[PDB]
């Protein structure tokens, strides 16, 4: 039994026609204090998987170390480590899902909410969620914390079910993600303007984007708002 | 000479030999013959079963490990049960923790290490059984020969047991023929039945005498006995 000290907010994701898009901001919050701003919360495993973690950062760094060890362990006595016997997004998730459930069963959980995004060897999109309780679920759009309340409603407008997946292109899917990051910066008190974005595609591969900022913000309407009821000036 | 260094497995001979390991290998040569062979699509095990009396049943030689993996035994049956049970657990561990079908090559590595630990410590004995592991994974069909020494070799075709040299000479001569038998299970079985018949000396292969197993591209590991092997007699 523990408590989270250094925390990372929402991790939002969705799947399009050719792959998946996942994004998370670069903040490491110390309670109400926005302490760290150079924190990468998206962990790429190989060239086909990106793991987005929210919650406790010290536990995230432990998971980050476990993923690096998995790559090293998979390459041992394996001549096809970069081909047929490479790490699939499904293998990476199931390993984490086993760990997350075993830790909560021992009453010492890793205080995190994790989304594994990737493309399988056959070309299929992979997007599954796992948290500190060990609860697992798949959905066309997946988000942690505040993203579940705010980003999901926006991302579900683009992809409402499984039939909307092949209809959504990369440009439309990324636009919905970038817009969701702007909305989260508006209403989440533990959010950062700077964020990272990762695209995993079956054709173009893995595209990792760093130092992206929230742009085109509407604030001009604030000057017209004065007082809290009866005040005119 | 030999009497002073064969007391236990821990002892080396002046020439550098391990006689307890060598005596365990002798238990295979006393055991009944079994043949393993493969192509690019399928892998086949053909085994000759042995009975004590005409009133006794024919002891099984082939054991199923997983839906995509299995092996045939030659030597001590209880030792084959232990090693197959371990391989059953290793296939089970990979499927539950990683959601991954265990590679046949990695399965051979696991059997190598378990057999090795019996040869370096006091009190232990080497396994008195040879195993022929077949399987179909992400890299295609596989055939591996296990030896009590720990030595595991990947082969196109092989045979272990009594009079097994006759079958081994056949497969070495027919190498270019059975390798190209793709998409046709029945013809690969016939190539193995003709292989095991080259090792016959005491009797001819009959209905309740022959044991055949196959695993392939769209074929799970299944064992045929009795009436199911009558068409190959």
At residue B2, the 3 state secondary structure works out as: helix
In the numeric block, which tokens belong to residue A186? 């508006």
- List A141's β-bridge partners, or say none: A14
* Chain A residues with CB-CB distance to B138 below 8 A: 80, 84-85, 121
**Contact indicator for A159, A169 with CB cutoff of 8 Å:** no
Q: What are phi and psi of A123, to 5 degrees?
A: 110, -10
- Rounded-to-5 percentages of helix, strand, coil across chain B: 40, 25, 35
CA separation for the pair A9, A28 (Å, rounded): 8
Task: Determine which helix (DSSP H) or strand (DSSP E) holds A51, and give its type and residue range.
Answer: strand A49-56
Kindly determine whether residue A94 and residue B98, on different chains, have CB atoms separated by under 8 Å. yes
Beta carbon pairs, A and B, within 8 Å: 29
Cα torsion A71, A77, A83, A84 to 10°: value is: -100
Buried b (16+ CB within 10 A) or exposed e, A192-206: bbbbbbbbbbbeeeb
* Chain B residues with CB-CB distance to A67 below 8 A: none
- What total of structural domains would you count in chain A? 1
Quickly tell me which residue has 């079958």 as its tokens: B167
B-facing residues of A in 76-95 (CB < 8 A) are: 77-78, 80, 84-85, 88, 90-91, 93-95
Check: CATH 3.60.20.10 for B1-233?
Answer: yes
DSSP symbol at B215: E
Nearest chain B Cα to A86, which residue?
Answer: B138
Residues 6+ apart with CB under 8 A from A230: none
For residue A85, give the nearest of B97, B109, B139 by CB distance: B139
B-facing residues of A in 127-156 (CB < 8 A) are: none
From the candidates A49, A67, A70, A77, which should be mutated to test the interface with B, based on the most B CB atoms within 10 A? A77
Our CA angle for B32, B36, B41, nearest 5°, is 160
At residue A77, the 3 state secondary structure works out as: coil
For residue B100, give the nearest of A78, A80, A91 by CB distance: A91
Cα torsion A184, A189, A194, A199 to 10°: value is: -40
At residue A209, the 3 state secondary structure works out as: strand
**Contact indicator for A96, B114 with CB cutoff of 8 Å:** no
Resolution in Å, one decimal, please.
2.7
**Contact indicator for B75, B27 with CB cutoff of 8 Å:** yes
Which domain does A38 fall in, by range? 1-233
In the numeric block, which tokens belong to residue A13? 């994701």
Q: Strand pairing of A28-30 and A49-56?
A: unpaired
Catalytic sites of A, residue numbers: 1
CA separation for the pair B135, B41 (Å, rounded): 10
**Contact indicator for A213, A49 with CB cutoff of 8 Å:** no
DSSP symbol at A220: G
Kindly determine whether residue A77 and residue B103, on different chains, have CB atoms separated by under 8 Å. no
Distance of CA A99 to the CA centre of its chain: 19
Residue B191: name the closest of B37, B28, B21, B1 by CA: B37
Helix axes A170-187, A146-155, angle to 10 degrees: 140
For residue A77, give the nearest of B98, B100, B109 by CB distance: B109
Residue A9: name the closest of A21, A23, A121 by CA: A23
For residue B138, give the nearest of A77, A84, A95 by CB distance: A84
Domain extents for chain B?
Answer: 1-233
Q: Strand pairing of B210-216 and B222-225?
A: antiparallel
Three-state DSSP string of B26-75:
HHHHHCCCEEEEECCCEEEEEEECECCCCCCCCECCEEECCCCEEEEEEE
Residues 6+ apart with CB under 8 A from B36: B43, B44, B45, B46, B72, B132, B134, B143, B145, B155, B157, B158, B159
Residues 6+ apart with CB under 8 A from A135: A129
**Contact indicator for A9, A145 with CB cutoff of 8 Å:** yes
Helix axes B185-196, B164-173, angle to 10 degrees: 130
Distance of CA A44 to the CA centre of its chain: 11
Q: Please tell me the distance in Å from B96's CA to the nearest CA on chain A.
A: 8
Kindly determine whether residue B97 and residue A77, on different chains, have CB atoms separated by under 8 Å. no
Q: Determine whether B67 is exposed, middle or buried from the number of CB atoms within 10 Å of its CB (0-12, 13-18, 19+).
A: middle
Task: Determine which helix (DSSP H) or strand (DSSP E) holds A3, and give its type and residue range.
Answer: none
In the numeric block, which tokens belong to residue A204? 């173009």
**Contact indicator for A47, A115 with CB cutoff of 8 Å:** no
Residue-wise DSSP of A91-120: HHHHHHHHHHHHHHHTT----EEEEEEEE-
CA separation for the pair B152, A60 (Å, rounded): 40
CA separation for the pair A62, A43 (Å, rounded): 12
- Helices of type H across chain A: 57-75, 89-105, 146-155, 170-187
Q: What is the CATH number of the domain that holds A198?
A: 3.60.20.10
């Amino acid at each position: 039994t523990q408590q989270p000290i250094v925390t990372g907010t929402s991790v939002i994701s969705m799947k399009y026609d050719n792959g998946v898009i996942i994004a998370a901001d670069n903040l490491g919050s110390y309670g109400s204090l926005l302490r760290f701003n150079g924190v990468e919360r998206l962990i790429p495993v190989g060239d086909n998987t990106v793991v987005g973690i929210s919650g406790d950062i010290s536990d995230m760094q432990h998971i980050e170390r476990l993923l690096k060890d998995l790559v090293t362990e998979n390459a041992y006595d394996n001549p096809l480590a970069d081909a047929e016997e490479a790490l699939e997004p499904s293998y990476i998730f199931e390993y984490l899902a086993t760990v997350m459930y075993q830790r909560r069963s021992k009453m010492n959980p890793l205080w995190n909410a994790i989304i594994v995004a990737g493309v399988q060897s056959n070309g299929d999109q992979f997007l599954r969620y796992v948290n500190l309780l060990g609860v697992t679920y798949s959905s066309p759009t997946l988000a942690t914390g505040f993203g579940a309340h705010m980003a999901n409603p926006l991302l579900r407008k683009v992809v409402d079910r499984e039939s909307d997946i092949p209809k959504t292109t990369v440009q439309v899917a990324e636009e919905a993600i970038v817009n969701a990051m702007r909305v989260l910066y508006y209403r989440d008190a533990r959010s950062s303007r700077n964020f990272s974005l990762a695209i995993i595609d079956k054709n173009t591969g893995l595209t990792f984007k760093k130092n992206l900022q929230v742009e085109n913000m509407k604030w001009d309407f604030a000057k017209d708002i004065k007082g809290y009821g009866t005040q005119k000036i | 000479f030999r009497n002073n260094y064969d007391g236990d497995t821990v002892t080396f001979s002046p020439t550098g030999r391990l006689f307890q390991v060598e005596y365990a290998l002798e238990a295979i040569k006393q055991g009944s013959v079994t043949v393993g062979l493969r192509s690019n699509t399928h892998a086949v095990l053909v085994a000759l079963k042995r009975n004590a009396d005409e009133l006794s049943s024919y002891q099984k030689k082939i054991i199923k490990c997983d839906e995509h993996m299995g092996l045939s035994l030659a030597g001590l049956a209880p030792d084959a049960r232990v090693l197959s049970n371990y391989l059953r657990q290793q296939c089970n561990y990979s499927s539950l923790v990683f959601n991954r079908k265990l590679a046949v090559e990695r399965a051979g590595h696991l059997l190598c290490d378990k057999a090795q630990k019996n040869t370096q410590s006091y009190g232990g004995r080497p396994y008195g059984v040879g195993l022929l592991i077949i399987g179909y994974d992400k890299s295609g069909a596989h055939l591996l020969e296990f030896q009590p020494s720990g030595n595991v070799t990947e082969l196109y075709g092989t045979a272990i047991g009594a009079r097994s040299q006759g079958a081994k000479t056949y497969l070495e001569r027919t190498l270019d023929t059975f390798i190209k038998i793709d998409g046709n299970p029945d013809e690969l079985i016939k190539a193995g039945v003709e292989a095991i018949s080259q090792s016959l000396r005491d009797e001819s292969l009959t209905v309740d005498n022959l044991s055949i197993a196959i695993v392939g591209k769209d074929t799970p590991f299944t064992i045929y006995d009795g009436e199911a092997v009558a068409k190959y007699i």
